[PDB]
Design a protein around this motif. Structure first.
Motif, mmCIF file in Angstrom:
data_model
loop_
_atom_site.group_PDB
_atom_site.id
_atom_site.type_symbol
_atom_site.label_atom_id
_atom_site.label_comp_id
_atom_site.label_asym_id
_atom_site.label_seq_id
_atom_site.Cartn_x
_atom_site.Cartn_y
_atom_site.Cartn_z
ATOM 1 N N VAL A 50 0.828 -1.198 0.000
ATOM 2 C CA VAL A 50 0.000 0.000 0.000
ATOM 3 C C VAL A 50 0.874 1.265 0.000
ATOM 4 C CG1 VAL A 50 -1.707 1.294 1.371
ATOM 5 C CG2 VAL A 50 -1.936 -1.152 1.022
ATOM 6 N N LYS A 91 -8.510 5.024 -0.946
ATOM 7 C CA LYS A 91 -7.074 5.114 -0.581
ATOM 8 C C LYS A 91 -6.321 5.453 -1.851
ATOM 9 C CE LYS A 91 -3.711 4.203 2.561
ATOM 10 N NZ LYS A 91 -3.733 5.264 3.601
ATOM 11 N N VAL A 133 -8.781 -3.322 -1.081
ATOM 12 C CA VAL A 133 -7.720 -2.328 -0.980
ATOM 13 C C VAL A 133 -7.092 -2.111 -2.348
ATOM 14 C CG1 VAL A 133 -5.485 -1.814 0.098
ATOM 15 C CG2 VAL A 133 -7.314 -2.911 1.400
ATOM 16 N N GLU A 164 -7.855 0.341 5.180
ATOM 17 C CA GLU A 164 -7.115 1.040 4.151
ATOM 18 C C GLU A 164 -7.756 0.927 2.782
ATOM 19 O OE1 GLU A 164 -2.811 1.441 4.704
ATOM 20 O OE2 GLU A 164 -3.068 0.177 6.465
ATOM 21 N N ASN A 194 0.729 4.245 -2.698
ATOM 22 C CA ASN A 194 0.166 5.499 -2.217
ATOM 23 C C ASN A 194 1.253 6.554 -2.199
ATOM 24 O OD1 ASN A 194 -1.831 7.177 -1.109
ATOM 25 N ND2 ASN A 194 -1.256 6.593 0.985
ATOM 26 N N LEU A 249 -4.225 0.658 -6.347
ATOM 27 C CA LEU A 249 -5.166 0.914 -5.267
ATOM 28 C C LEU A 249 -6.602 1.078 -5.766
ATOM 29 C CD1 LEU A 249 -2.872 3.398 -3.337
ATOM 30 C CD2 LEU A 249 -3.694 1.202 -2.427
#
Lengths: 75, 74
Positions: free
Chosen positions: A9, B66, A51, B50, A13, A65
């Motif tokens: 992640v 996210k 996610v 998340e 991100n 994402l």
């Protein structure tokens, strides 16, 4: 989230040097200490949890994402 | 994913939808049968997982999928 998933992640991100999706092998490149099968398992669990989103691409797969695809289409 | 959570994700996962900023009360507007605290707990679970990110904005809080904040910035 477990550390290995959090590292996926955190890579995705990012503002700079990023894009909406990356190849399966981009993730194995980033985590060379992990078994490739385990990278596939953690990415798949993150897709199941929404996610990440999943794509087929040519002979392989891509991941990004959740929402990144629609956001990039929007432009 | 549970139905209310999936409704939030589907609402945000759209072209229209990615062009906009959505605040806490915009989500409570979509769940008229729920208490504000129940919606705050749904959204907070999605942030914990998340799937969403959130932050303080103005007089309230803003939620997105996210990565949306840094995608848009780039």
């Amino acid at each position: 989230m477990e550390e290995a998933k959090q590292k996926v992640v955190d890579f995705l991100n990012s503002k700079s040097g990023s894009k909406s999706k990356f190849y399966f092998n981009d993730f194995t490149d980033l985590f060379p200490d992990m078994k490739q099968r385990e990278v596939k398992k953690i990415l798949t669990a993150l897709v199941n949890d929404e996610v990440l989103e999943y794509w087929s691409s040519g002979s392989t797969t891509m991941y990004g994402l959740k929402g990144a695809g629609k956001q990039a289409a929007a432009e």
